[PDB]
Design an enzyme around this catalytic site. Sequence first.
Site, PDB file in Angstrom:
ATOM      1  N   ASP A  15      32.119 -64.263  98.185  1.00 42.06           N
ATOM      2  CA  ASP A  15      31.289 -65.508  98.448  1.00 42.06           C
ATOM      3  C   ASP A  15      31.160 -66.294  97.047  1.00 42.06           C
ATOM      4  O   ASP A  15      30.189 -67.275  97.604  1.00 42.06           O
ATOM      5  CB  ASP A  15      30.163 -65.435  99.188  1.00 42.06           C
ATOM      6  CG  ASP A  15      29.291 -64.439  98.478  1.00 42.06           C
ATOM      7  OD1 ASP A  15      29.221 -64.226  97.376  1.00 42.06           O
ATOM      8  OD2 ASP A  15      28.141 -63.799  99.453  1.00 42.06           O
ATOM      9  N   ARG A  29      28.697 -71.143  95.317  1.00 42.37           N
ATOM     10  CA  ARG A  29      28.307 -70.053  96.192  1.00 42.37           C
ATOM     11  C   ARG A  29      28.733 -70.689  97.691  1.00 42.37           C
ATOM     12  O   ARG A  29      28.443 -71.797  98.100  1.00 42.37           O
ATOM     13  CB  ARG A  29      26.981 -69.821  96.111  1.00 42.37           C
ATOM     14  CG  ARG A  29      26.458 -68.840  97.062  1.00 42.37           C
ATOM     15  CD  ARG A  29      26.924 -67.291  96.876  1.00 42.37           C
ATOM     16  NE  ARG A  29      26.234 -66.391  97.935  1.00 42.37           N
ATOM     17  CZ  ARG A  29      26.265 -66.188  99.108  1.00 42.37           C
ATOM     18  NH1 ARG A  29      26.989 -67.014  99.842  1.00 42.37           N
ATOM     19  NH2 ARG A  29      25.400 -65.368  99.677  1.00 42.37           N
ATOM     20  N   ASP A  34      27.443 -64.161 103.775  1.00 40.58           N
ATOM     21  CA  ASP A  34      27.076 -63.246 102.841  1.00 40.58           C
ATOM     22  C   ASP A  34      28.363 -62.079 102.761  1.00 40.58           C
ATOM     23  O   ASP A  34      28.275 -61.503 103.684  1.00 40.58           O
ATOM     24  CB  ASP A  34      25.699 -62.625 103.189  1.00 40.58           C
ATOM     25  CG  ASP A  34      25.168 -61.678 101.905  1.00 40.58           C
ATOM     26  OD1 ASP A  34      25.700 -61.893 100.886  1.00 40.58           O
ATOM     27  OD2 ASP A  34      24.590 -60.748 102.277  1.00 40.58           O
ATOM     28  N   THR A  35      29.034 -61.993 101.836  1.00 46.53           N
ATOM     29  CA  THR A  35      30.037 -60.956 101.668  1.00 46.53           C
ATOM     30  C   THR A  35      29.170 -59.761 101.035  1.00 46.53           C
ATOM     31  O   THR A  35      28.455 -59.905 100.418  1.00 46.53           O
ATOM     32  CB  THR A  35      31.103 -61.440 100.722  1.00 46.53           C
ATOM     33  OG1 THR A  35      30.650 -61.946  99.472  1.00 46.53           O
ATOM     34  CG2 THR A  35      32.017 -62.312 101.583  1.00 46.53           C
ATOM     35  N   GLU A  37      28.687 -57.155  98.030  1.00 46.49           N
ATOM     36  CA  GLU A  37      28.878 -57.053  96.521  1.00 46.49           C
ATOM     37  C   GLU A  37      30.239 -56.079  96.455  1.00 46.49           C
ATOM     38  O   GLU A  37      30.626 -55.467  97.177  1.00 46.49           O
ATOM     39  CB  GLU A  37      27.892 -56.636  95.706  1.00 46.49           C
ATOM     40  CG  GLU A  37      26.473 -57.369  95.924  1.00 46.49           C
ATOM     41  CD  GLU A  37      26.432 -58.737  95.817  1.00 46.49           C
ATOM     42  OE1 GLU A  37      27.150 -59.089  94.711  1.00 46.49           O
ATOM     43  OE2 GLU A  37      25.569 -59.729  96.282  1.00 46.49           O
ATOM     44  N   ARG A  75      24.397 -72.756  90.884  1.00 50.84           N
ATOM     45  CA  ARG A  75      25.690 -72.572  91.761  1.00 50.84           C
ATOM     46  C   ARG A  75      25.647 -73.755  92.683  1.00 50.84           C
ATOM     47  O   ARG A  75      24.787 -73.939  93.380  1.00 50.84           O
ATOM     48  CB  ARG A  75      25.859 -71.235  92.414  1.00 50.84           C
ATOM     49  CG  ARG A  75      25.532 -69.988  91.564  1.00 50.84           C
ATOM     50  CD  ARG A  75      25.836 -68.851  92.074  1.00 50.84           C
ATOM     51  NE  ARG A  75      24.812 -68.667  93.257  1.00 50.84           N
ATOM     52  CZ  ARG A  75      24.504 -67.501  93.863  1.00 50.84           C
ATOM     53  NH1 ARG A  75      25.305 -66.369  93.948  1.00 50.84           N
ATOM     54  NH2 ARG A  75      23.723 -67.448  94.905  1.00 50.84           N
TER      55      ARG A  75
HETATM   56  C1  LIG Z   1      23.972 -69.150 100.215  1.00 50.80           C
HETATM   57  C2  LIG Z   1      22.669 -69.361  99.515  1.00 50.80           C
HETATM   58  C3  LIG Z   1      21.761 -68.498  98.471  1.00 50.80           C
HETATM   59  N1  LIG Z   1      20.822 -68.908  97.806  1.00 50.80           N
HETATM   60  C4  LIG Z   1      19.824 -68.006  96.983  1.00 50.80           C
HETATM   61  C5  LIG Z   1      19.387 -66.945  97.867  1.00 50.80           C
HETATM   62  C6  LIG Z   1      19.373 -65.799  97.325  1.00 50.80           C
HETATM   63  O1  LIG Z   1      18.034 -65.726  96.380  1.00 50.80           O
HETATM   64  P1  LIG Z   1      17.895 -64.074  95.448  1.00 50.80           P
HETATM   65  O2  LIG Z   1      18.785 -64.090  94.506  1.00 50.80           O
HETATM   66  O3  LIG Z   1      16.530 -64.466  95.089  1.00 50.80           O
HETATM   67  O4  LIG Z   1      18.130 -62.894  96.565  1.00 50.80           O
HETATM   68  C7  LIG Z   1      20.631 -65.628  96.497  1.00 50.80           C
HETATM   69  C8  LIG Z   1      21.605 -64.738  97.464  1.00 50.80           C
HETATM   70  O5  LIG Z   1      23.036 -65.089  96.762  1.00 50.80           O
HETATM   71  P2  LIG Z   1      23.944 -63.892  96.451  1.00 50.80           P
HETATM   72  O6  LIG Z   1      24.360 -63.495  98.017  1.00 50.80           O
HETATM   73  O7  LIG Z   1      25.267 -64.450  95.829  1.00 50.80           O
HETATM   74  O8  LIG Z   1      23.227 -62.792  95.830  1.00 50.80           O
HETATM   75  O9  LIG Z   1      21.003 -67.051  96.500  1.00 50.80           O
HETATM   76  C9  LIG Z   1      20.212 -70.112  98.187  1.00 50.80           C
HETATM   77  O10 LIG Z   1      19.154 -70.603  97.658  1.00 50.80           O
HETATM   78  N2  LIG Z   1      20.850 -71.157  98.967  1.00 50.80           N
HETATM   79  C10 LIG Z   1      21.837 -70.466  99.862  1.00 50.80           C
HETATM   80  O11 LIG Z   1      22.556 -71.558 100.553  1.00 50.80           O
HETATM   81 CA   LIG Z   2      26.900 -61.592  98.428  1.00 50.89          CA
END
Ligand SMILES: Cc1cn([C@H]2C[C@H](OP(=O)(O)O)[C@@H](COP(=O)(O)O)O2)c(=O)[nH]c1=O
Ligand SMILES: [Ca+2]
EC number: 3.1.31.1
Length: 129
Positions: A15, A29, A34-35, A37, A75
């Site tokens: 993702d 991103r 959510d894929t 890890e 991102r």
């Molecule tokens: C997809 C997405 C993720 N995020 C943030 C939420 C999560 O915060 P946290 O890192 O505090 O868990 C993180 C999840 O991304 P990942 O799934 O790439 O880890 O990215 C956003 O803020 N907006 C979004 O649209």
């Molecule tokens: Ca992920």
Amino acid sequence: LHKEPATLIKAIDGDTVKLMYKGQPMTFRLLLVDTPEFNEKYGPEASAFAKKMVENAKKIEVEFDKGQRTDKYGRGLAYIYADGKMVNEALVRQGLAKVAYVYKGNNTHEQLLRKAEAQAKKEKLNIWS
Ligand SMILES: Cc1cn([C@H]2C[C@H](OP(=O)(O)O)[C@@H](COP(=O)(O)O)O2)c(=O)[nH]c1=O
Ligand SMILES: [Ca+2]
């Protein structure tokens, strides 16, 4: 929403992907998914699927939603298209991602993706197997 040009710099994982957008390297991103890890079950398959998709594409496009375009990690937040097919959707439809992170006002394609998730679930694909 509007599709904008970008070119692949490098696949990263299911993702996230590195693209050049308006001439600048950025990590994107994928909205609304959510894929797993890489280190988790189906992580390598999600990564492989996303990599194949963007690496084989003649034309990559970025589509921002109505809200925030960058997350707290810098991102880009977008829907990514490979030769007109949405990567976000394709991952969900194959059971290699779950609909996730649905925040108010960056959720234009939510119902499209939930419909794909339902079909992936019905056929018991991958994550839903
Ligand atoms: C997809 C997405 C993720 N995020 C943030 C939420 C999560 O915060 P946290 O890192 O505090 O868990 C993180 C999840 O991304 P990942 O799934 O790439 O880890 O990215 C956003 O803020 N907006 C979004 O649209
Ligand atoms: Ca992920």
